[PDB]
Amino acid sequence: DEVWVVGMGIVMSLIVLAIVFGNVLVITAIAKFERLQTVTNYFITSLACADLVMGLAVVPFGAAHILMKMWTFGNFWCEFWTSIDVLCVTASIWTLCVIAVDRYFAITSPFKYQSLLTKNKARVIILMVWIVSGLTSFLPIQMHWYRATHQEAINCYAEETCCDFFTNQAYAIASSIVSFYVPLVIMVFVYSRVFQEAKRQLNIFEMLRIDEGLRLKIYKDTEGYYTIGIGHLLTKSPSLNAAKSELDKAIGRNTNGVITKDEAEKLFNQDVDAAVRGILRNAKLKPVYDSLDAVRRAALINMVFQMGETGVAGFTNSLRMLQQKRWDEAAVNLAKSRWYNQTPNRAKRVITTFRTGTWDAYKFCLKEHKALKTLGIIMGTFTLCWLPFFIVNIVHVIQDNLIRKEVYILLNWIGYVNSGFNPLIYCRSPDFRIAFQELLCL
Ligand SMILES: CC(C)CCC[C@@H](C)[C@H]1CC[C@H]2[C@@H]3CC=C4C[C@@H](O)CC[C@]4(C)[C@H]3CC[C@]12C
Ligand SMILES: CC(C)(C)NC[C@H](O)COc1nsnc1N1CCOCC1
């Protein structure tokens, strides 16, 4: 139908436009802004490149093959088009597997969020991917090791107006296992460990950085008292110079109301140490700290950090039920407090920690932890976009008459739309957000 062709033509054009402009913007943002020239962003550059090659050389000719129902580019370009197509996908899934593995080695290292690979080393890994995956994508098609022995296929090979991808059962299993499933199985298992390590390796220092936050300039909290760094109270006095005086003495230099990351961490390491020391000095809190597990020990430290040894001691009724290990019971009395009303968002997180005995409340609450979530969304979406096509592709190998030709192309296109999703997912990263709007002048 006429309306169907024009209708599909517009949909496919807006898909192609979204692929190219999206990835160009991403590549441009990493190339221009220094703050985005990281090891993990260099892998994203390789991912965005493969996604750009898709919408520039693959997807455009794919559309013409559907709207005209015939190949009008020759048998040399037909095989080259298919070779690039496979490479784009193979390079993308291996890139995602590398990102996953590099994230495991970073989280297991004492660096926790910084990569063990250098900028020169990362370039080698990317170049090795494109070379290795380039060989497994071009050699099995150019040497015609992919060609089937049935008449319908040999007729399509000889025909210059036929580019229907016909294959033998061997290649269909071999190429799909090496190219897609092997990096996918590894990626899923390795990045599930990355998520498991992130949640498990959560500590009080990260927990307070989540709750209190970070600001290197003097600000007023909910209570209204002068604060700086990670919830470090300066004075209860409503005077800026009084707040500045107590600050310059603590650091030991002319700060002028501004501190560094090195300085903010230094006072934070002191406050945390003072909180625990205050618990050990307090007779009411001392036996409660003993009975609690590592996770709930941090939750008591968190309250002592915000209110103070004396303030936390006032919850006599609640503390008694923490010792009794009746978490759900203690939580109700903790909720029935002025502290709960003062900071409900922070109170919920701390109360839930006591209830669960896990960091489940502080799940992806950290900025470094949000970065991992975004990368997990990229890998997970690639799976949802490509796995249906790959399952049906291997189902076709076992039984020939299982699915129609229209089902194969439709599922292949589900994977094609994926090359337009990745730039929109980078909107989660505030570093990319600022880069994008700067290049778009908004
Ligand atoms: C279609 C085929 C033949 C062309 C393949 C394109 C090749 C040349 C491209 C695609 C991805 C590219 C890489 C993307 C990532 C980076 C990070 C950047 O900081 C330095 C260059 C480097 C390492 C690129 C080198 C060239 C590269 C490997
Ligand atoms: C069939 C067509 C139109 C050339 N698209 C190819 C697909 O987009 C993906 O191709 C692949 N990339 S990695 N492994 C594969 N496959 C899928 C098709 O069968 C051979 C192995």
Swiss-Prot record:
The chain crosses the membrane at residues 7-30, 44-67, 79-101, 123-146, 169-192, 375-398, 406-429. Residues 68-78, 147-168, 399-405 are extracellular. Disulfide bonds join 78-163, 156-162. Changing residue 441 to G: Uncoupled receptor. This is Beta-2 adrenergic receptor. It comes from Homo sapiens. One of its GO terms (molecular function) is potassium channel regulator activity. Binds NHERF1 and GPRASP1. Interacts with ARRB1 and ARRB2. Interacts with SRC. Interacts with USP20 and USP33. Interacts with VHL; the interaction, which is increased on hydroxylation of ADRB2, ubiquitinates ADRB2 leading to its degradation. Interacts with EGLN3; the interaction hydroxylates ADRB2 facilitating VHL-E3 ligase-mediated ubiquitination. Interacts (via PDZ-binding motif) with SNX27 (via PDZ domain); the interaction is required when endocytosed to prevent degradation in lysosomes and promote recycling to the plasma membrane. Interacts with CNIH4. Interacts with ARRDC3. It is a multi-pass membrane protein. GO terms for biological process: adenylate cyclase-activating adrenergic receptor signaling pathway; adenylate cyclase-modulating G protein-coupled receptor signaling pathway; adrenergic receptor signaling pathway; AMPA selective glutamate receptor signaling pathway; bone resorption; brown fat cell differentiation; cell surface receptor signaling pathway; cellular response to amyloid-beta.
